[PDB]
Amino acid sequence: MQFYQADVLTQGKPVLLNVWATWCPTCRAEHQYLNQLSAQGIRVVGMNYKDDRQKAISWLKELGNPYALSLFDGDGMLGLDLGVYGAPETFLIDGNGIIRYRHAGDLNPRVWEEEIKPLWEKYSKEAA
């Protein structure tokens, strides 16, 4: 069990927080897409939710780990309030630890390209 300060997750810059599970139908494809965004330099923090830890681990080994930091059930965050949340959701947090967007559903090229990416750029320039 590990707890993290908000600043450790953001490092003073925007970050994506993805809440996922192996039982989630759209999460397999989403995972593969995150590997792509992660390669493009996007910092992503993962939160495995209401899932079997061992199955999540195997999932990350088989398909790869796009997460800079990976959290599981039992882990927590300090200084970051997500309110009522759960899988499948993706949050955009700015460099100051403020939630600037939340998307319920799977993260795919369209949501990223049309909805989130512009906000990400917005706060990237603001943090820099």
Short mmCIF file of all heavy atoms in Angstrom, two decimals, residues 5-40:
data_model
loop_
_atom_site.label_atom_id
_atom_site.label_comp_id
_atom_site.label_asym_id
_atom_site.label_seq_id
_atom_site.Cartn_x
_atom_site.Cartn_y
_atom_site.Cartn_z
N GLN A 5 1.80 12.14 -2.68
CA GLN A 5 1.50 13.56 -2.58
C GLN A 5 1.13 13.96 -4.01
O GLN A 5 1.65 13.39 -4.97
CB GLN A 5 2.75 14.35 -2.17
CG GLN A 5 3.27 14.07 -0.78
CD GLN A 5 2.72 15.04 0.24
OE1 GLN A 5 1.52 15.11 0.47
NE2 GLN A 5 3.62 15.81 0.85
N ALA A 6 0.24 14.94 -4.14
CA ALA A 6 -0.18 15.38 -5.47
C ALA A 6 0.98 15.87 -6.33
O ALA A 6 1.02 15.60 -7.53
CB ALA A 6 -1.21 16.49 -5.33
N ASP A 7 1.92 16.58 -5.73
CA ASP A 7 3.05 17.11 -6.47
C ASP A 7 3.94 16.04 -7.08
O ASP A 7 4.60 16.27 -8.09
CB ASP A 7 3.89 18.03 -5.59
CG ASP A 7 4.25 17.39 -4.27
OD1 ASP A 7 3.36 17.31 -3.39
OD2 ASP A 7 5.41 16.97 -4.11
N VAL A 8 3.97 14.87 -6.45
CA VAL A 8 4.77 13.76 -6.95
C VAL A 8 4.16 13.23 -8.25
O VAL A 8 4.88 12.79 -9.15
CB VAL A 8 4.83 12.61 -5.92
CG1 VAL A 8 5.43 11.36 -6.56
CG2 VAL A 8 5.67 13.04 -4.73
N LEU A 9 2.84 13.28 -8.34
CA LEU A 9 2.13 12.82 -9.53
C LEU A 9 2.26 13.80 -10.69
O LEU A 9 2.49 13.40 -11.83
CB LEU A 9 0.65 12.60 -9.20
CG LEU A 9 0.34 11.74 -7.97
CD1 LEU A 9 -1.14 11.84 -7.63
CD2 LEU A 9 0.72 10.29 -8.25
N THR A 10 2.10 15.09 -10.41
CA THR A 10 2.15 16.09 -11.47
C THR A 10 3.55 16.57 -11.83
O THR A 10 3.84 16.83 -13.00
CB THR A 10 1.34 17.35 -11.10
OG1 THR A 10 1.94 17.99 -9.96
CG2 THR A 10 -0.10 16.99 -10.78
N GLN A 11 4.41 16.68 -10.83
CA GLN A 11 5.77 17.19 -11.03
C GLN A 11 5.69 18.65 -11.51
O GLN A 11 6.59 19.14 -12.19
CB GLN A 11 6.54 16.37 -12.07
CG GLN A 11 6.65 14.89 -11.75
CD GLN A 11 7.68 14.20 -12.61
OE1 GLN A 11 7.75 14.43 -13.82
NE2 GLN A 11 8.49 13.34 -12.00
N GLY A 12 4.59 19.32 -11.16
CA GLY A 12 4.43 20.71 -11.55
C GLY A 12 3.94 20.92 -12.98
O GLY A 12 3.90 22.05 -13.48
N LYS A 13 3.56 19.83 -13.64
CA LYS A 13 3.07 19.91 -15.01
C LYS A 13 1.81 19.07 -15.16
O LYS A 13 1.52 18.23 -14.33
CB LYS A 13 4.15 19.44 -15.99
CG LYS A 13 5.37 20.34 -16.02
CD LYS A 13 6.37 19.92 -17.09
CE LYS A 13 6.98 18.56 -16.78
NZ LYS A 13 8.06 18.20 -17.76
N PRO A 14 1.03 19.31 -16.23
CA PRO A 14 -0.20 18.53 -16.41
C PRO A 14 0.05 17.03 -16.54
O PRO A 14 1.11 16.60 -16.99
CB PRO A 14 -0.82 19.14 -17.67
CG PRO A 14 0.37 19.71 -18.41
CD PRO A 14 1.20 20.31 -17.30
N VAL A 15 -0.94 16.24 -16.12
CA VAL A 15 -0.82 14.79 -16.19
C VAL A 15 -2.20 14.21 -16.42
O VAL A 15 -3.21 14.84 -16.12
CB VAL A 15 -0.25 14.21 -14.85
CG1 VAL A 15 -1.25 14.40 -13.72
CG2 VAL A 15 0.06 12.72 -15.01
N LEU A 16 -2.23 13.01 -16.98
CA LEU A 16 -3.49 12.32 -17.18
C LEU A 16 -3.55 11.25 -16.10
O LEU A 16 -2.54 10.61 -15.78
CB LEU A 16 -3.55 11.64 -18.54
CG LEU A 16 -3.63 12.50 -19.80
CD1 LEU A 16 -3.98 11.59 -20.97
CD2 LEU A 16 -4.68 13.59 -19.64
N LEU A 17 -4.74 11.08 -15.52
CA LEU A 17 -4.93 10.06 -14.50
C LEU A 17 -5.99 9.14 -15.10
O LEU A 17 -7.11 9.56 -15.35
CB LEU A 17 -5.45 10.71 -13.21
CG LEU A 17 -5.42 9.91 -11.91
CD1 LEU A 17 -6.44 10.52 -10.96
CD2 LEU A 17 -5.78 8.46 -12.16
N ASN A 18 -5.63 7.88 -15.33
CA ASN A 18 -6.57 6.94 -15.93
C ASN A 18 -6.99 5.88 -14.91
O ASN A 18 -6.15 5.20 -14.32
CB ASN A 18 -5.91 6.29 -17.15
CG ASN A 18 -6.89 5.48 -17.98
OD1 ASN A 18 -6.65 4.31 -18.28
ND2 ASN A 18 -7.99 6.10 -18.36
N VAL A 19 -8.30 5.75 -14.71
CA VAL A 19 -8.86 4.79 -13.76
C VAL A 19 -9.39 3.63 -14.61
O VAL A 19 -10.29 3.80 -15.43
CB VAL A 19 -10.00 5.44 -12.94
CG1 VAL A 19 -10.41 4.54 -11.79
CG2 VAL A 19 -9.52 6.79 -12.40
N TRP A 20 -8.80 2.45 -14.41
CA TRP A 20 -9.12 1.29 -15.22
C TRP A 20 -9.22 -0.03 -14.45
O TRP A 20 -8.90 -0.11 -13.26
CB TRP A 20 -8.04 1.15 -16.28
CG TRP A 20 -6.68 0.85 -15.67
CD1 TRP A 20 -5.89 1.71 -14.97
CD2 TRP A 20 -6.01 -0.42 -15.65
NE1 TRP A 20 -4.77 1.05 -14.49
CE2 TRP A 20 -4.83 -0.26 -14.90
CE3 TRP A 20 -6.31 -1.68 -16.18
CZ2 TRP A 20 -3.93 -1.32 -14.67
CZ3 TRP A 20 -5.43 -2.73 -15.96
CH2 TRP A 20 -4.25 -2.54 -15.21
N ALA A 21 -9.64 -1.06 -15.17
CA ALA A 21 -9.76 -2.40 -14.61
C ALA A 21 -9.69 -3.44 -15.72
O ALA A 21 -10.04 -3.16 -16.87
CB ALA A 21 -11.07 -2.53 -13.84
N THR A 22 -9.23 -4.65 -15.39
CA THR A 22 -9.14 -5.71 -16.37
C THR A 22 -10.53 -6.20 -16.79
O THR A 22 -10.69 -6.74 -17.89
CB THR A 22 -8.35 -6.92 -15.83
OG1 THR A 22 -8.97 -7.40 -14.63
CG2 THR A 22 -6.90 -6.51 -15.52
N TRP A 23 -11.53 -6.01 -15.93
CA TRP A 23 -12.90 -6.44 -16.25
C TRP A 23 -13.65 -5.48 -17.18
O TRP A 23 -14.72 -5.81 -17.70
CB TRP A 23 -13.73 -6.66 -14.97
CG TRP A 23 -13.70 -5.52 -13.96
CD1 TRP A 23 -13.06 -5.52 -12.75
CD2 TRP A 23 -14.34 -4.24 -14.08
NE1 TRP A 23 -13.25 -4.33 -12.12
CE2 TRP A 23 -14.02 -3.52 -12.90
CE3 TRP A 23 -15.13 -3.63 -15.05
CZ2 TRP A 23 -14.48 -2.21 -12.68
CZ3 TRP A 23 -15.58 -2.33 -14.83
CH2 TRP A 23 -15.26 -1.63 -13.66
N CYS A 24 -13.08 -4.30 -17.37
CA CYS A 24 -13.68 -3.28 -18.22
C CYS A 24 -13.47 -3.62 -19.70
O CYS A 24 -12.34 -3.76 -20.16
CB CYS A 24 -13.07 -1.92 -17.82
SG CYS A 24 -12.79 -0.69 -19.13
N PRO A 25 -14.58 -3.79 -20.45
CA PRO A 25 -14.62 -4.14 -21.88
C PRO A 25 -13.81 -3.30 -22.87
O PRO A 25 -13.25 -3.84 -23.83
CB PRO A 25 -16.12 -4.10 -22.20
CG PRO A 25 -16.75 -4.45 -20.89
CD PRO A 25 -15.95 -3.62 -19.93
N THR A 26 -13.75 -1.99 -22.65
CA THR A 26 -13.03 -1.10 -23.54
C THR A 26 -11.60 -0.80 -23.09
O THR A 26 -10.85 -0.12 -23.79
CB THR A 26 -13.78 0.26 -23.67
OG1 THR A 26 -13.98 0.81 -22.36
CG2 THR A 26 -15.13 0.06 -24.34
N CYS A 27 -11.21 -1.31 -21.93
CA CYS A 27 -9.89 -1.05 -21.37
C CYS A 27 -8.70 -1.69 -22.08
O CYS A 27 -7.60 -1.16 -22.02
CB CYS A 27 -9.90 -1.41 -19.88
SG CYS A 27 -10.83 -0.20 -18.86
N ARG A 28 -8.92 -2.81 -22.76
CA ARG A 28 -7.84 -3.48 -23.48
C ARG A 28 -7.32 -2.58 -24.61
O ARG A 28 -6.12 -2.32 -24.71
CB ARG A 28 -8.37 -4.79 -24.08
CG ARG A 28 -7.32 -5.66 -24.75
CD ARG A 28 -6.55 -6.47 -23.73
NE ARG A 28 -5.62 -7.41 -24.37
CZ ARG A 28 -4.86 -8.27 -23.70
NH1 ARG A 28 -4.91 -8.31 -22.37
NH2 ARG A 28 -4.04 -9.08 -24.36
N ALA A 29 -8.24 -2.10 -25.44
CA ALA A 29 -7.91 -1.23 -26.56
C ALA A 29 -7.39 0.11 -26.05
O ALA A 29 -6.50 0.72 -26.65
CB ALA A 29 -9.14 -1.02 -27.44
N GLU A 30 -7.97 0.57 -24.95
CA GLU A 30 -7.57 1.84 -24.36
C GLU A 30 -6.12 1.75 -23.91
O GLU A 30 -5.34 2.68 -24.08
CB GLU A 30 -8.46 2.15 -23.17
CG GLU A 30 -8.09 3.42 -22.44
CD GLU A 30 -8.94 3.62 -21.21
OE1 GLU A 30 -8.63 3.01 -20.16
OE2 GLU A 30 -9.93 4.37 -21.30
N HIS A 31 -5.78 0.61 -23.32
CA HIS A 31 -4.44 0.38 -22.82
C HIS A 31 -3.42 0.57 -23.95
O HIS A 31 -2.42 1.27 -23.81
CB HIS A 31 -4.34 -1.04 -22.27
CG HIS A 31 -3.09 -1.29 -21.50
ND1 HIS A 31 -2.91 -0.86 -20.20
CD2 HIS A 31 -1.95 -1.94 -21.83
CE1 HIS A 31 -1.72 -1.23 -19.77
NE2 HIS A 31 -1.11 -1.89 -20.74
N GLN A 32 -3.70 -0.08 -25.08
CA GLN A 32 -2.81 0.00 -26.23
C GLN A 32 -2.66 1.43 -26.74
O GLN A 32 -1.59 1.83 -27.18
CB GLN A 32 -3.34 -0.91 -27.34
CG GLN A 32 -3.48 -2.36 -26.88
CD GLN A 32 -3.96 -3.29 -27.97
OE1 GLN A 32 -5.08 -3.17 -28.47
NE2 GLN A 32 -3.10 -4.23 -28.35
N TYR A 33 -3.74 2.20 -26.67
CA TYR A 33 -3.68 3.58 -27.12
C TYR A 33 -2.84 4.41 -26.14
O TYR A 33 -2.11 5.31 -26.55
CB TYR A 33 -5.09 4.16 -27.25
CG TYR A 33 -5.11 5.59 -27.71
CD1 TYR A 33 -4.41 5.98 -28.86
CD2 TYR A 33 -5.80 6.57 -27.00
CE1 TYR A 33 -4.40 7.31 -29.28
CE2 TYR A 33 -5.79 7.90 -27.42
CZ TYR A 33 -5.09 8.26 -28.55
OH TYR A 33 -5.05 9.58 -28.96
N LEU A 34 -2.94 4.12 -24.85
CA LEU A 34 -2.16 4.85 -23.86
C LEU A 34 -0.67 4.62 -24.07
O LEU A 34 0.14 5.52 -23.84
CB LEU A 34 -2.57 4.45 -22.44
CG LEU A 34 -3.94 4.99 -22.02
CD1 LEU A 34 -4.31 4.44 -20.66
CD2 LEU A 34 -3.91 6.51 -22.00
N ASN A 35 -0.31 3.41 -24.49
CA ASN A 35 1.09 3.10 -24.76
C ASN A 35 1.60 4.08 -25.82
O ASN A 35 2.74 4.55 -25.76
CB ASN A 35 1.22 1.67 -25.29
CG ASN A 35 1.31 0.64 -24.18
OD1 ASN A 35 0.88 -0.51 -24.34
ND2 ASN A 35 1.89 1.03 -23.05
N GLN A 36 0.73 4.40 -26.78
CA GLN A 36 1.06 5.33 -27.86
C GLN A 36 1.24 6.76 -27.35
O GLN A 36 2.23 7.42 -27.66
CB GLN A 36 -0.03 5.27 -28.93
CG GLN A 36 0.00 6.41 -29.94
CD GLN A 36 -0.99 6.22 -31.08
OE1 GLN A 36 -1.36 7.18 -31.76
NE2 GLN A 36 -1.43 4.98 -31.28
N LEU A 37 0.28 7.25 -26.57
CA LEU A 37 0.36 8.60 -26.02
C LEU A 37 1.57 8.72 -25.10
O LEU A 37 2.25 9.75 -25.09
CB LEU A 37 -0.92 8.95 -25.25
CG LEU A 37 -2.19 9.20 -26.08
CD1 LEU A 37 -3.33 9.63 -25.16
CD2 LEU A 37 -1.92 10.30 -27.11
N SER A 38 1.83 7.67 -24.33
CA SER A 38 2.95 7.66 -23.41
C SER A 38 4.26 7.82 -24.17
O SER A 38 5.20 8.45 -23.68
CB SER A 38 2.96 6.35 -22.63
OG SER A 38 3.93 6.38 -21.60
N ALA A 39 4.32 7.25 -25.36
CA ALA A 39 5.51 7.32 -26.21
C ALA A 39 5.69 8.73 -26.77
O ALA A 39 6.81 9.15 -27.07
CB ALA A 39 5.41 6.31 -27.34
N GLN A 40 4.58 9.45 -26.92
CA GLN A 40 4.62 10.81 -27.45
C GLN A 40 5.00 11.82 -26.38
O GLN A 40 4.99 13.03 -26.63
CB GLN A 40 3.26 11.17 -28.05
CG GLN A 40 2.82 10.24 -29.17
CD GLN A 40 1.48 10.64 -29.76
OE1 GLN A 40 0.91 9.91 -30.57
NE2 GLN A 40 0.98 11.80 -29.36
#
